[PDB]
Design a protein around this ligand. Sequence first.
Ligand SMILES: [Mn+2]
Ligand SMILES: [Mn+2]
Ligand SMILES: [Mn+2]
Ligand SMILES: [Mn+2]
Ligand SMILES: [Mn+2]
Ligand SMILES: [Mn+2]
Lengths: 455, 455, 326
Amino acid sequence: AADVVACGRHTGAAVGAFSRRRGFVARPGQVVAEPSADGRAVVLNVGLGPAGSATAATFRAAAAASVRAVGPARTLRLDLALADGSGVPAAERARAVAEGAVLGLYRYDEYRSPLAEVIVATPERRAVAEGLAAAEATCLARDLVNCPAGTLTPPAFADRIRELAHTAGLDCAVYEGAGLTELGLTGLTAVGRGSAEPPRYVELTYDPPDLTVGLVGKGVTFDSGGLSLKPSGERHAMKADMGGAAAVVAALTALPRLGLPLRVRGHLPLAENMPDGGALRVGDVVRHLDGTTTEITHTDNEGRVVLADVLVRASRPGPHRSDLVVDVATLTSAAVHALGTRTGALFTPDDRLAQTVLAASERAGESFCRLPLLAHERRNLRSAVADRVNCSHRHGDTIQAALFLQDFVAAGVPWAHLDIAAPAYNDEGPYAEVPYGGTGFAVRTLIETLRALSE
Amino acid sequence: AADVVACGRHTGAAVGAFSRRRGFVARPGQVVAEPSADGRAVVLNVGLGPAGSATAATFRAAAAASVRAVGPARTLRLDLALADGSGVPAAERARAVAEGAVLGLYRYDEYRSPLAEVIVATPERRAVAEGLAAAEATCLARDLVNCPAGTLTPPAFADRIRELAHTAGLDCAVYEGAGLTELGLTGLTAVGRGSAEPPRYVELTYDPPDLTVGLVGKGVTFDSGGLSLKPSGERHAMKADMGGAAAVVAALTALPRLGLPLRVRGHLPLAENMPDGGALRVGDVVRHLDGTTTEITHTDNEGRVVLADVLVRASRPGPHRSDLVVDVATLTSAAVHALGTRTGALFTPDDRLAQTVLAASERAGESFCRLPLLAHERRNLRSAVADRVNCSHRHGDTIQAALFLQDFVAAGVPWAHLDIAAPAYNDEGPYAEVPYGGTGFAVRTLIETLRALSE
Amino acid sequence: EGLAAAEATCLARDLVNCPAGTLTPPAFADRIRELAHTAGLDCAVYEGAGLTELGLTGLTAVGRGSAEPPRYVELTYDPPDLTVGLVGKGVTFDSGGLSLKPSGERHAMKADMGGAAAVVAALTALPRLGLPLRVRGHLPLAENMPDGGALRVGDVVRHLDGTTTEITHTDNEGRVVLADVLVRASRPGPHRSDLVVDVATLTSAAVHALGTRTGALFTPDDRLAQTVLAASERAGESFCRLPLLAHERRNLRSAVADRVNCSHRHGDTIQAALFLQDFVAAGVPWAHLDIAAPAYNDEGPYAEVPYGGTGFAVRTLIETLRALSE
Ligand SMILES: [Mn+2]
Ligand SMILES: [Mn+2]
Ligand SMILES: [Mn+2]
Ligand SMILES: [Mn+2]
Ligand SMILES: [Mn+2]
Ligand SMILES: [Mn+2]
């Protein structure tokens, strides 16, 4: 039995006397190992819960639990997708089992000083291939987020995107120094100025021969806070503030494999936010690409300032025309207080786009909830000096940040904003298919959203 | 095989192909379950590490890991103590396996809305019986510490000690109200006054027909801080501030089973420290039983004030004469900063008593380190008003608290002080034989110390 | 002998009291060079590219944020008459780095080179005493400053022994700086350092338990412990031994590297000692002296101790080296 075989069991399914004696009750993610019938290999009995309540997430989580229980085995065959009786069709089971296996195997050992084959048993080969690709993209995002900021600097991150673009056949332009200055991304330049690592701006285009979607990803490779320095003695995953950029890049790398008939452009501002003799100051004013002005009332609300000019560039009327814009950003720390650590916030004025993103997230097994663009919170954007502030010092910053970003989206362009600060990094232990640390959150939601949009 | 049999394996010992295929490498506490040879029951292979490095703690921890992996089995036989090859003699193996099994099975489910038999296989029946008794005493302390303070009030705790004394044949006197006032325990009375639950004082004596040892246990059943109220938003196990009293009571309950030829008296001041219109005030002075005075500079350093008069009573020259005094107290929060969460502090001027307690702790597998009674820290006891303060507001409070207690021990009486604030409560997850929450720390050290003293 | 021991102590007092803007790492290296020359001690100063070649990546990473570049100095007392290695933490100014020390709390940030001061001063006294033993001083010198190019939380240092440390708090910089020096000092090689003692104003957690006038001693070697403690008694300096608790190693674990420089949990004094232990070559006896609190007296003068820099550990070291030479 190829070293280890993992069998999915719904509640009520038969297992041997040994599994029963060990307490196997088919609880989701429960794994009991036993010798195979011939005594030459290992069987894992893996719980899928009641058949009537099982979802694709159940299969995804059960696959992750299987690969975690593999021990020193060289080969693992997952039969989980062959369990029927639930409402989850075979193709969705196969896709989810494939995702969960890759996501569950993920390790980040690059900075530390025998499993050779995972096989998914199913006729749904296409679904398996899609699952593997989606999960591999997620793991790419995980690597990028986990990467120490001293390795993944803005220049190094730009180089990495260039290499990934080259592999995938994606068109890539990297802007730096004077070339960057010409673009008028004054938020990026101002925020990035304090650091010894100069900022970068990268555009990625997936453009198959077969609507144009713009993806904007916040790539603050290290967020210290700037002069409004993050308190020492509080823990912050400061290197993880490029999770939005990671999600966008990774999603873009998966599109050529899927062959989606839609044009997608990625827009990635990359910078460090550092304290320094030449750092952006509280009370300074940024004049943005659209001529409007932002007073910097708190240097740690840097992401919205960096994204502003990119949203103008991405959405402005011009050559070939981006029909809709989605931004992804580890933007706000206020959200998590209400929503908790595992749910992202979705903002959009477009109800059908909201539905498209939420349904995409459900298929992907990623938790989002929509928050309203409350008109009465615009009063908290007011500045005594400029057109707006980047920080009100009042409650409601998650909503205020969304309204701030909305100011820079050209009139009539459908737009959605994904604030993923909390779910982008897991500071608790591993659970299900999610490791400690960088999660790659939103990659799969984005892929699913782009699929629906292409249909 | 009696549902489940647990086999101890040192590194290099033979296991079946299944255990090897699962990755069993005899790592301490590693458990791999497999069917028995006849297919009718369960075998647990349990790691004991290399034979040359195994200690009694290894066996204790391996036993705890065994009982945790039992599943729904009705009977468990531990063969762990029959593994030889290590330096741990058979009797010590049996004692430790017995302790670990009971300690590992411990659960505290009283306030929540199939295992019927654990058997230890060995000829060392006496050692097993001693291990079970020591562990049962530890679990009694665990229950007392875990108990909600609203259930274990000072009056209710006094009643519980009375019941335990009655079972064991121990002489017990409970003092309350006017009877308590007569004893002159003015620290206890002053600290306890703010609460609606009145304080208690309990004396327990083990007095077999076969030296007199005095045990003093801090029994603050709930420490809010008093008027110097503990900051809300910081977590404190305020109900666990009676861990010292718990350890002393539990140790006393084990002595009749062991039949130690020594007289041991327990002295237990019990109170709540609460804010109230009538609570002890910052700047108030307590006149103690020896006529000396303490200025209350911080109401949250209440334990030393409560213990002071009890130490005078316990050590004063008088009827039958207590030859040595050991106090146990969850006293200080400063210690943990240096020593960490799993090590108690030991203070004594007596080098041979220090050695006796430390060696006892080693046998028991409880971590202590001796701290010095630094003469230059007495300057931090000075008060502008009284003979001493209960808080210097300077670094070194763990040492200062010990010196404070030393003031009340009658001249020439050997004395040791055990500060166990951190190890008395585990606020991390369970590990080895230690659960989350109340640990019963110091019970086994005390029993081992009294054994050595009786020899 | 008393005058010489006290004069060495006063040299350490001067070095600690010196404003950090005067006693920069380059200036401190120059001062050691001058003191070595007086005493007849062999001295090598490493800087820039020459420093880079040594692979002291902890020192370089910690020191990078400052405008004052780091230095590394080796001092050898080598009379014609065992080889003892002394490692001294020389952070000439510890601001905290990006994990910046809170403003409104008082810290003697210039005093974070007290360990280096004690080692240098002890070495200057040896030629006067004529002790028959070879003693090498190893002094990493740097400023820990916030800057656009400062070491970041989450960065990984790859040390001279190939092992890795994740920087979870930039204010636990001393252990990171000392790591590579301990590898260099203890590695098997030419003439062979038989034992290593490090002295460092390392930890702020200790003082909570021990108070302001007592240093912490760590060593797995019971006889070396006794030698140092008895030396301290003769010198009138207060130390207490703390255990190298095996169960505190779990708090060194990192999700990314081989270890962290900060657990954000209780027990950092012990954890820091275990961290340093990782870099001492197998079989080399080692002791660690954590003297953050007693190195600087922030209360008024008492007895023979002034306000400010105390020169703590100089006399203990001299007494320890005397006993070791006998
Ligand atoms: Mn920020
Ligand atoms: Mn940010
Ligand atoms: Mn208290
Ligand atoms: Mn208390
Ligand atoms: Mn520091
Ligand atoms: Mn330092």
